[PDB]
A paper describes a structure:
[name] (HA) is an IVA surface protein that allows the virus to attach to host cell receptors and enter the cell. HA is a homotrimeric glycoprotein, with each monomer composed of two regions: (1) the head, comprising the receptor binding domain (RBD) which is crucial in viral attachment, and (2) the stalk, that is responsible for viral and cell membrane fusion in the endosome. Mammalian IVA infection is initiated through HAs binding to α2,6 sialic acid-linkage galactose receptors on the host cell surface, before entering the cell via endocytosis. Following endocytosis, HAs undergo conformational rearrangements due to the low pH of the endosome, leading to membrane fusion.
The full length mature HA1/HA2 trimer crystal structures are as follows: (1) A/Fort Monmouth/1/1947 solved at 2.95 Å resolution, (2) A/Jiangsu/ALS1/2011 solved at 2.35 Å resolution, (3) A/Almaty/32/1998 solved at 2.05 Å resolution, (4) A/Hickox/JY2/1940 solved at 1.95 Å resolution, (5) A/Netherlands/[name]/1951 solved at 2.5 Å resolution, and (6) A/Melbourne/1/1946 solved at 2.55 Å resolution. The antibody [name] Fab failed to bind many of our other IVA HAs, as examined by analytical size exclusion chromatography. Failure to bind correlated with an insertion in HA between 146R-G147 of the epitope, whereas sequences without an insertion bound the antibody. Our other IVA HA structures all contain an insertion near the [name] Fab CDR3 binding site that appears to prevent antibody binding, via either insertion of an Asn which becomes glycosylated to physically block [name] binding, or insertion of an Arg, Lys, or Ile into the [name] binding pocket. Although the insertion of either a glycosylated residue observed in the electron density of our structures (A/Netherlands/[name]/1951 and A/Fort Monmouth/1/1947) or of a bulky side chain which partially changes the loop conformation (A/Jiangsu/ALSI/2011, A/Almaty/32/1998, A/Hickox/JY2/1940, and A/Melbourne/1/1946) appears consistent with the loss of [name] antibody Fab binding by analytical SEC, rigorous mutational analysis and quantitative binding experiments would be required to prove these are evasion mechanisms. It is possible, for example, that the glycosylation could be accommodated by movement of the positioning of the antibody as was the case for the S245N glycosylation site of H3N2 viral neuraminidases with IG01 antibodies (Ref PubMed ID 36543789).
Numbering used by the authors:
A (entry chain A): 2 to 322, 330 to 488, 492 to 494
B (entry chain B): 2 to 324, 330 to 492
C (entry chain C): 2 to 324, 330 to 485
Write the structure that this text describes.
Amino acid sequence: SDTICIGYHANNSTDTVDTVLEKNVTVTHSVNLLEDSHNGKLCRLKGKAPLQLGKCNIAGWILGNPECESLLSKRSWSYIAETPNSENGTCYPGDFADYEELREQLSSVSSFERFEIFPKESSWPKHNTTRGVTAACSHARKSSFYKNLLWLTEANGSYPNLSKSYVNNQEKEVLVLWGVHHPSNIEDQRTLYRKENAYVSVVSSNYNRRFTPEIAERPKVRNQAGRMNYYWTLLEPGDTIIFEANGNLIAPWYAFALSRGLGSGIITSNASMDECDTKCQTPQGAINSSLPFQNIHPVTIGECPKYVKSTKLRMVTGLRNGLFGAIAGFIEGGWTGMMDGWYGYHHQNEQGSGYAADQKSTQNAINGITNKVNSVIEKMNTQFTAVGKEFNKLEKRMENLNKKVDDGFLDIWTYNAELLVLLENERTLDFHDSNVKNLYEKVKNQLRNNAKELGNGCFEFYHKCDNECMESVKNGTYDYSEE
Amino acid sequence: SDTICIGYHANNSTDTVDTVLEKNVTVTHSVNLLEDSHNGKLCRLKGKAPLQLGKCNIAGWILGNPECESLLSKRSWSYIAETPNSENGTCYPGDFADYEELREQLSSVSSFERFEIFPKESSWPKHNTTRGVTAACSHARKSSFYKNLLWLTEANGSYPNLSKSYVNNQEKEVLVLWGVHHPSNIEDQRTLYRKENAYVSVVSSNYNRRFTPEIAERPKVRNQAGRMNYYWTLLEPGDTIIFEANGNLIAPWYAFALSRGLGSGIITSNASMDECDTKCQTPQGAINSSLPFQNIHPVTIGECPKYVKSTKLRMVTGLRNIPGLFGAIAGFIEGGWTGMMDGWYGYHHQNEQGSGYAADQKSTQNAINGITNKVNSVIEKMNTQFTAVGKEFNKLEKRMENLNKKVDDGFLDIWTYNAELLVLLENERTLDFHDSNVKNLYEKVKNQLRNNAKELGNGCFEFYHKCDNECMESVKNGTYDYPKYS
Amino acid sequence: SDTICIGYHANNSTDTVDTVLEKNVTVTHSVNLLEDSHNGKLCRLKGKAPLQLGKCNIAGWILGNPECESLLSKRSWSYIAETPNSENGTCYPGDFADYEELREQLSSVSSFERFEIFPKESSWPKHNTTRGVTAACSHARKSSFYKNLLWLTEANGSYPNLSKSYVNNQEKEVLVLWGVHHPSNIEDQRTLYRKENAYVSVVSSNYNRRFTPEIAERPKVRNQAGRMNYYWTLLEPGDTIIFEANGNLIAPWYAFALSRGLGSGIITSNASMDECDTKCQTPQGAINSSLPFQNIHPVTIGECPKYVKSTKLRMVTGLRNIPGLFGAIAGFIEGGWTGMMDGWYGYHHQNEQGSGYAADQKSTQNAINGITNKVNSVIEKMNTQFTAVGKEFNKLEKRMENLNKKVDDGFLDIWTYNAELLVLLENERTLDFHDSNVKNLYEKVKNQLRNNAKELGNGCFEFYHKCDNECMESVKNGT
Ligand SMILES: *[C@@H]1O[C@H](CO)[C@@H](O[C@@H]2O[C@H](CO)[C@@H](O[C@@H]3O[C@H](CO[C@H]4O[C@H](CO)[C@@H](O)[C@H](O[C@H]5O[C@H](CO)[C@@H](O)[C@H](O)[C@@H]5O)[C@@H]4O)[C@@H](O)[C@H](O[C@H]4O[C@H](CO)[C@@H](O)[C@H](O)[C@@H]4O)[C@@H]3O)[C@H](O)[C@H]2NC(C)=O)[C@H](O)[C@H]1NC(C)=O
Ligand SMILES: *[C@@H]1O[C@H](CO)[C@@H](O[C@@H]2O[C@H](CO)[C@@H](O[C@@H]3O[C@H](CO[C@H]4O[C@H](CO)[C@@H](O)[C@H](O)[C@@H]4O)[C@@H](O)[C@H](O[C@H]4O[C@H](CO)[C@@H](O)[C@H](O)[C@@H]4O)[C@@H]3O)[C@H](O)[C@H]2NC(C)=O)[C@H](O)[C@H]1NC(C)=O
Ligand SMILES: *[C@@H]1O[C@H](CO)[C@@H](O[C@@H]2O[C@H](CO)[C@@H](O[C@@H]3O[C@H](CO)[C@@H](O)[C@H](O)[C@@H]3O)[C@H](O)[C@H]2NC(C)=O)[C@H](O)[C@H]1NC(C)=O
Ligand SMILES: *[C@@H]1O[C@H](CO)[C@@H](O[C@@H]2O[C@H](CO)[C@@H](O)[C@H](O)[C@H]2NC(C)=O)[C@H](O)[C@H]1NC(C)=O
Ligand SMILES: *[C@@H]1O[C@H](CO)[C@@H](O[C@@H]2O[C@H](CO)[C@@H](O)[C@H](O)[C@H]2NC(C)=O)[C@H](O)[C@H]1NC(C)=O
Ligand SMILES: *[C@@H]1O[C@H](CO)[C@@H](O[C@@H]2O[C@H](CO)[C@@H](O)[C@H](O)[C@H]2NC(C)=O)[C@H](O)[C@H]1NC(C)=O
Ligand SMILES: *[C@@H]1O[C@H](CO)[C@@H](O[C@@H]2O[C@H](CO)[C@@H](O)[C@H](O)[C@H]2NC(C)=O)[C@H](O)[C@H]1NC(C)=O
Ligand SMILES: *[C@@H]1O[C@H](CO)[C@@H](O)[C@H](O)[C@H]1NC(C)=O
Ligand SMILES: *[C@@H]1O[C@H](CO)[C@@H](O)[C@H](O)[C@H]1NC(C)=O
Ligand SMILES: *[C@@H]1O[C@H](CO)[C@@H](O)[C@H](O)[C@H]1NC(C)=O
Ligand SMILES: *[C@@H]1O[C@H](CO)[C@@H](O)[C@H](O)[C@H]1NC(C)=O
Ligand SMILES: *[C@@H]1O[C@H](CO)[C@@H](O)[C@H](O)[C@H]1NC(C)=O
Ligand SMILES: *[C@@H]1O[C@H](CO)[C@@H](O)[C@H](O)[C@H]1NC(C)=O
Ligand SMILES: *[C@@H]1O[C@H](CO)[C@@H](O)[C@H](O)[C@H]1NC(C)=O
Ligand SMILES: *[C@@H]1O[C@H](CO)[C@@H](O)[C@H](O)[C@H]1NC(C)=O
Ligand SMILES: *[C@@H]1O[C@H](CO)[C@@H](O)[C@H](O)[C@H]1NC(C)=O
Ligand SMILES: *[C@@H]1O[C@H](CO)[C@@H](O)[C@H](O)[C@H]1NC(C)=O
């Protein structure tokens, strides 16, 4: 007897997917949508390396703590990496005004340039510029001080009025930092500033603040009962800043001209830097930006996949290894032997035997599933952003609001991703079930009376069929010689 | 021989939709789910017109900058519209305390009424009330000052202690604003206030602050080295506010009795206002709220379609236009019928009495009702809370500004993804549905005409027996007398 | 002649669901996905009862308003419940610094220990410790004061310098509260403090502030033109706090050692407490947390279903009830069988030995298992973290308040839309599924009886050969 069979692919694949109706379905071909690995390194974003702070936090780096590396020239960075629990910040204890705010300002800086705003050798001719050192800020076992500030003191029994101004002719924003010293007793205030009641005044076109030292005994920090409060402001292009004091000023020595870029952010990381590039950086390492979802870390920088709590997001592209009754229905098994398509034919006649795929229906199915995967992947809108937000000890409400935002996006993206994969995996299998059922009915319609339907997807020809009648039948031309 | 064919509609439509399996599919009918047009005007929200500030920002308007129009009547507004050239604010340089907070609080009011809190002519018998004008607040080429504040100065060589109180009897909140002058040198401090050390004190039942002038040389803004700081508080009904100073006070002259309503916001727009109503205002113009999505602007006020980055959201309602999951459409019935123009699905008959198309009304009306219900569900399930998306943050609120941007951008990402895929997937489902309606019509006829006709394999049945117009009507209305012909 | 029929289940159910194509479809079985009821009481979260403040707000409780002495002995809680009449707070008028911030801090406290930081009887030997009472803080018709603070005044014509330190040896954070008095006139300043210009100083390793009294005429609140501003700080373990003053200090008397727990929150509720447990508390009452969605209240504490504006989220699990896409149900098999009560799909046989219905167990069991897996996926994929939705903002934080409102409202719109459409679309898919299982059941037998029977067109086959009960069982068993 002669036979033409319609059937589908099977292979040695062990891939499993989940579907809305069935868990743990072994499938022939599949695509993973979930980034779940990282390279364990810090990499370049947008071509530039990050600003690496090493032993310091931003306070110590921006103030110039003697244990931190100085930036002498103009530099650029993609994001900032500080390590956890950096211990070199404000070596002299005090309050850093709007510290988190300043950290956020430095996260959106494309270029950054240190310059000597009030040069130490020439700006203070009637004050002592070389005695302002302390053991709290020592380096290599010798006392020192912040490299960007200058602790002025009395000279020859007097601390005269000082008035120092600076005009921003840099055609960009200038970040100016300064300090105010608060002694632990009036003896030290008298010794250093030759006055009991001093003041500091700092003004620009849009900044204006007056400081008066407050003297009291305090618990010792870094063996210091005194305090220095740190302050900063952004001087607009063309604007001037005026410093006026008769005591206690920790004066600007170096300041920073800066250029703004894309908003970036700060990564806390114990990971080391490497000679890699990336479109998306996480605290434990860089991740590929090709898939729509990732489960490595919710706080990322770059053009990043959405963070999900999922551990598996596997999308079926092939077949069971149903809704339309053929696959796992009346055609109960796949053909490992057919290795050139998803759907096709098996012939058995006197002229020879073997499997062959139907190129038309397989190519249509391959092209459609490809469009489906590309839509799940490429419809994902991806802007360059920095997720992280920093809040101080009196911003717990803002911190919890930020956590409620990140967590809600996580719940929405996790649920929708899980269910999308479950439902569309079901749809993809029905699509294959319907492509083979339509292939069967196409041949049945052509083979109207010339064959018996065996009920297994196979038709036994009455008309004697060689290897020549079939090529016309699989090419869909038939002339409906009874044995 | 006589023949009855099953087929589906085709027309001259050029609409294209995308589906999960195929992009750019030509279809007979489709619906747009994406608002992509606005009317270019500012409209009334919740029945009320916005406050239009024109040349002024809220600061200049509320202080009474001499270049701003004063409000003589009691009025109401749903939101505030300032223009990109709103440049007239604090004409005398200084800090406006909690400015953004005041902008948000003033953005929608049930009633608003300016009134003379401390009449200039009668409240300060021992101070100079006529010398406090400056070129920084010039008007008509003459020095001037804010119309709602009064710059008190010394009179006859003395600036006496002042203590002025006001009881809120307005049975609503009163917005009281005031200022503090900070001279640029001690000579000016002496000349105007006859003291080097002055203070200002302002107290209510829940507001309590003391100000002392700080004198220093400062860079000149609008040719002023001095500074004036502006302050405000909302005095609750029945409460008292007390001003105490011996110098430097920029005193309240007019205040505002107001009732605030549900929180609104500020629109920055160069669009003109019109006598239109809307549920959703956008900076470039009002938009309809009938569709679930819009791509006009992310920052809107009202009950608004969700903002998406999509450029096209077209939902198929009809069929592939050919002038498949179930094998019929674009399968064995490979083409549509331009000739059938009164339904989606139907028949072509040819017998000795004539030929022509006819739509199957039952199955067509069923499909129209389902697709209608499907489109209405996609549209009407969209809950949109009244919201004012915009948020203003000052130079020290950058983290807050980025948190607000992360919220708007996260919602944009969720809604764009969900909108695109919903249309991609439901477009596929709608086409499967039409394909399955044609299969069931074809199979319905095949069951009726069991052996009395040959299946040609293209949607057509070749009758063995002669079939007239009562027989053809019998097949199309599903009362085919099968035994009669066997 | 002998007949075998394929059909589907029908019952007396009146449940209705909506589908994307058709509203209000009567179905045989369904599951509710929407929690829409609550028990009307306050319950224990994570095993611990809430702190009920009753007549007091948090200011009155933490400061020790004399009308809150019944709250001085509560030490552990899961969340805080204030009532709509919580009116006893700062009985002496003034500003409470970072009050909302402190309310959020106390929302995340596991254990709480009040302790006498500066004992009134022994810490102030040269000041008057018994005169600092006022009618603004009355108790039992006698002037009084906060039970956790001490209003120090001059003794015998002088208010001497004071310096008091405290070392946190509690091995946990110590919440320290204090105040600064601001009289309305300089006569009262001299009377209480023997000084016109005083100062207060409070310092630790990370806190540093100096306060100066401001003397001015003020409107009277609770008959007081004076003011007391309230302050606090969290003292780190091992750190020292130093109080220094020569006047106007309202000194700490008791402080609080606290241990943080899971971040929780504050509920305002008129509901009474009961001896119940819940994984989710709402202001009107506790709710079940089993379903993925609830419509009771958007501001919840616990592991909570997502809040939706929906009034009905019913998912069909069974079939159209007749007491489609694949053409059988409501197609050529126009009705369901109330008689078949042992399955969703099955057969009716009629031959010379008898008649009756029989469910096809394989196809029914396969369908029941698949629909079960689907219902469980919709439910169990819902990630539910312990959260406290609520956020409190003061009169100068409207922008923050409206940003929090935009966040809550955005999540509500996303979840409502997605829930409604998921149910409409999966209800359609579920009904399509049943239509397809009966079509495949019909087609299986039609292939089996290729020439031996006439297809009647209603799901029934008229046997040509006489078919007995072993022939019938083989057709129903596919043998
Ligand atoms: C309650 O709290 C108040 C605070 O509000 C206390 O008031 C303060 O008390 C302290 C001590 O009681 C006062 O400090 C003293 O100041 C005098 C005045 O010194 C000045 O006057 C002289 C010239 O006019 C000169 O002697 C001084 O020179 C000092 O400073 C320079 C700095 O370079 C240095 O070179 C010198 O060597 C001197 O150090 C200065 O110009 C000062 O003379 C006192 O010295 C005494 O104390 C120190 C330390 O104890 C000791 O070393 C000396 O031997 C000497 O015995 C001292 O420093 C402060 O001025 C007060 N402040 C106010 C506002 O009144 C009050 O005392 C507290 N009461 C109680 C009961 O505790
Ligand atoms: C370091 O910093 C301190 C504080 O910042 C400065 O101290 C101030 O210095 C100014 C300038 O000398 C002082 O102002 C002066 O006040 C004198 C007194 O004026 C009052 O009394 C007279 C007569 O009773 C009245 O006519 C007058 O209207 C006032 O009521 C004035 O007479 C001075 O004017 C002289 O200088 C100006 C220019 O500056 C001329 O135009 C005049 O013609 C006149 O010759 C002057 O205005 C001020 O009092 C000081 N403050 C304090 C708190 O003492 C230091 O000067 C500064 N530098 C140094 C080196 O210490
Ligand atoms: C920069 O960072 C380093 C590392 O954190 C700092 O060195 C550390 O300084 C702390 C504080 O002084 C030391 O702790 C103290 O040790 C001393 C002596 O043992 C003791 O008296 C204190 O009670 C406390 O235990 C710590 O041991 C020390 N560690 C090392 C490795 O040196 C340094 O101070 C920082 N310098 C600047 C300028 O920021
Ligand atoms: C600033 O103060 C320092 C220390 O008080 C002065 O340093 C002294 O300088 C002389 C030379 O002029 C040396 O002989 C001393 O040994 C230095 N003392 C110390 C402790 O190093 C310094 O001179 C002062 N600055 C100016 C400009 O006079
Ligand atoms: C109101 O706004 C106008 C325009 O912003 C101001 O006029 C400008 O004033 C500056 C002086 O600082 C000049 O440099 C410009 O040439 C002016 N522009 C025009 C078009 O005249 C005006 O001063 C503002 N007035 C007040 C009271 O705020
Ligand atoms: C005007 O009011 C002030 C304050 O009420 C009176 O007293 C002065 O107050 C300031 C504080 O702002 C102190 O620095 C002064 O020392 C006070 N003057 C004294 C004590 O004589 C002032 O007396 C009042 N003016 C008149 C004319 O009564
Ligand atoms: C505790 O709260 C009550 C009510 O909120 C406070 O005031 C009572 O209010 C009404 C009159 O307005 C009456 O019940 C009593 O006359 C009021 N009581 C008193 C003592 O005035 C009460 O003052 C609050 N107590 C404290 C210490 O804050
Ligand atoms: C999933 O299927 C694989 C075979 O494909 C099997 O080895 C494994 O145990 C299954 N896991 C289950 C049923 O949980
Ligand atoms: C103070 O005297 C020293 C003496 O060595 C001198 O070097 C310094 O320049 C003087 N300070 C001045 C002139 O401001
Ligand atoms: C889309 O379809 C239209 C109409 O058939 C056709 O003209 C156009 O070339 C197609 N291509 C794209 C990219 O839209
Ligand atoms: C808004 O809808 C109305 C009613 O359908 C319509 O007349 C109007 O043109 C629409 N406007 C815009 C801008 O779409
Ligand atoms: C100052 O004195 C003149 C003449 O006595 C008088 O006209 C004027 O009103 C006085 N100033 C004030 C504020 O009354
Ligand atoms: C107020 O000041 C002006 C100067 O601008 C002066 O001419 C006038 O007389 C003064 N009036 C009083 C009452 O002092
Ligand atoms: C069906 O068509 C026949 C032929 O004209 C007609 O006589 C009969 O009334 C129709 N039955 C219906 C519409 O139910
Ligand atoms: C829905 O259908 C039922 C019949 O099962 C009917 O009683 C009811 O009135 C219909 N409408 C609503 C809103 O329930
Ligand atoms: C404190 O003051 C009260 C009343 O003012 C008085 O009865 C008491 O004896 C005083 N005690 C001391 C120690 O001064
Ligand atoms: C101080 O006040 C107490 C309060 O009772 C009093 O007994 C004593 O006599 C007063 N005088 C002195 C010097 O202690």
